[PDB]
Design a protein around this motif. Structure first.
Motif, short mmCIF file in Angstrom:
data_model
loop_
_atom_site.label_atom_id
_atom_site.label_comp_id
_atom_site.label_asym_id
_atom_site.label_seq_id
_atom_site.Cartn_x
_atom_site.Cartn_y
_atom_site.Cartn_z
N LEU A 103 10.91 -4.98 -2.35
CA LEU A 103 10.28 -5.96 -1.67
C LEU A 103 9.37 -5.03 -0.61
O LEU A 103 8.24 -5.30 -0.76
CB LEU A 103 11.33 -6.85 -1.01
N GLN A 104 10.26 -4.27 0.25
CA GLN A 104 9.44 -4.04 1.39
C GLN A 104 8.57 -2.66 1.29
O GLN A 104 7.68 -2.25 2.22
CB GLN A 104 10.39 -3.52 2.47
N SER A 106 7.31 -1.84 -2.16
CA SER A 106 6.86 -2.11 -3.45
C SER A 106 7.17 -1.21 -4.47
O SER A 106 6.53 -0.75 -5.33
CB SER A 106 5.31 -2.09 -3.18
N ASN A 191 8.79 -6.53 5.82
CA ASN A 191 7.86 -6.08 4.59
C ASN A 191 6.93 -4.97 5.20
O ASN A 191 6.35 -5.17 6.53
CB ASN A 191 7.18 -6.99 3.89
N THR A 193 4.30 -3.52 3.95
CA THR A 193 3.03 -3.07 3.19
C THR A 193 1.75 -4.35 3.41
O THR A 193 0.65 -4.03 2.95
CB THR A 193 2.89 -3.10 1.84
N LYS A 211 5.14 -10.60 1.06
CA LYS A 211 5.33 -9.76 0.05
C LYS A 211 3.96 -9.83 -0.56
O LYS A 211 3.02 -10.62 -0.99
CB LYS A 211 6.33 -10.19 -1.17
N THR A 212 3.29 -8.36 -0.83
CA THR A 212 1.94 -8.27 -1.14
C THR A 212 1.99 -7.60 -2.73
O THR A 212 3.21 -7.57 -3.34
CB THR A 212 1.49 -6.93 -0.20
CL LIG Z 1 5.52 -4.91 -0.25
#
Ligand SMILES: [Cl-]
Ligand SMILES: *[B@@]1([O])OC2=C([C]=[C]C(F)=C2C([O])=O)[C]2[C][C]21
Ligand SMILES: [Cl-]
Ligand SMILES: [Cl-]
Ligand SMILES: [Cl-]
Length: 267
Positions: A103-104, A106, A191, A193, A211-212
């Motif tokens: 998640l955090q 990627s 997160n 990013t 989340k990106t």
């Molecule tokens: Cl992310």
């Protein structure tokens, strides 16, 4: 009219950077919504990793997995952009840390390992989205081949609206129990990013979990967030972009601005 004006601004922003923007947002206090190309398909990129960690959390909750079980991968050739899994190769990671690193940060190794061992591959990931009522989402490929972002390709895509719906159900609604949802929320909150995206579109003391995704092709990037403004019901914001040409670079600022317009439209 403030909806038609938002449409006008998104259309202008999309021309400005020569590409395509899709948005869906929801004010969960009023039930107000705003959508722009909200039914069109965009590549997910890393963005599905937020749902992958929710799938893990659902399995933990069904007692099918244990958040503290060690996951070992001493011999794996780690995919590119495994910043977390690389450091811990030698010792393993808990299931929970591995899911939260997908998640955090990627992390692609985290992503692929969990899909192979716990989730049943891209089709299990898709199946989990069906289980929560998302008919739009499809995942077809593994990291990193899923990032190709070819115009007109349906593989590994979703709609802004479907992503928004899903995040609402998972982050705010009923799929995860009390204790487990808190965990997913805190995951989204830390997160790392997304400072240049949805977070950049919002006052300083609003809390944001997001989340990106960044395809690295066709200037394809995205972000989805749960937003807690001060003393107000949460917002759901989902922003997906693609660009005409293969070598285009993604636009963080366009994403942040598209967020700003979206948030105004529901306000
Ligand atoms: Cl992310
Ligand atoms: B995923 O599309 O997302 C991603 C990667 C690397 C660094 C990042 F910040 C992100 C992102 O934007 O979440 C790799 C390519 C995959
Ligand atoms: Cl695609
Ligand atoms: Cl963000
Ligand atoms: Cl972009």
């Amino acid at each position: 009219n403030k909806s038609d004006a938002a449409a006008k601004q998104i259309k202008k922003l999309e021309e400005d950077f020569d590409g395509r923007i899709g948005v869906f947002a929801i004010d969960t206090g009023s039930g107000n919504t705003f959508g722009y190309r909200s039914d069109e398909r965009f590549p997910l990129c890393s963005s599905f990793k937020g749902f992958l960690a929710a799938a893990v959390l659902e399995r933990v909750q069904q007692k099918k997995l244990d958040i503290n079980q060690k996951v070992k991968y001493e011999s794996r050739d780690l995919e590119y952009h495994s910043p977390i899994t690389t450091k811990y190769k030698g010792s393993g990671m808990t299931l929970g840390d591995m899911a939260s690193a997908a998640l955090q940060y990627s992390d692609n190794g985290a992503t692929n390992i969990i899909m192979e061992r716990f989730l049943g591959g891209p089709e299990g990931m898709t199946k989990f989205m069906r289980s929560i009522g998302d008919n739009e989402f499809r995942l077809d490929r593994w990291e990193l081949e899923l990032n190709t972002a070819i115009p007109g390709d349906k593989r590994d895509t979703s709609t802004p609206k479907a992503v928004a719906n899903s995040l609402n159900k998972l982050a705010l609604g009923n799929v995860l129990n009390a204790k487990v949802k808190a965990i997913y929320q805190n995951w989204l909150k830390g997160n790392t990013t997304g400072d240049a995206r949805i977070r950049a579109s919002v006052p300083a003391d609003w809390v944001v979990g997001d989340k990106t995704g960044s395809c690295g092709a066709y200037g394809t990037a995205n972000d989805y967030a749960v937003i807690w403004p001060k003393n107000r019901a949460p917002l759901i914001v989902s922003i997906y972009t693609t660009r005409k040409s293969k070598d285009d670079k993604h636009s963080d600022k366009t994403i942040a601005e598209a967020s700003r317009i979206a948030i105004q439209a529901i306000d």
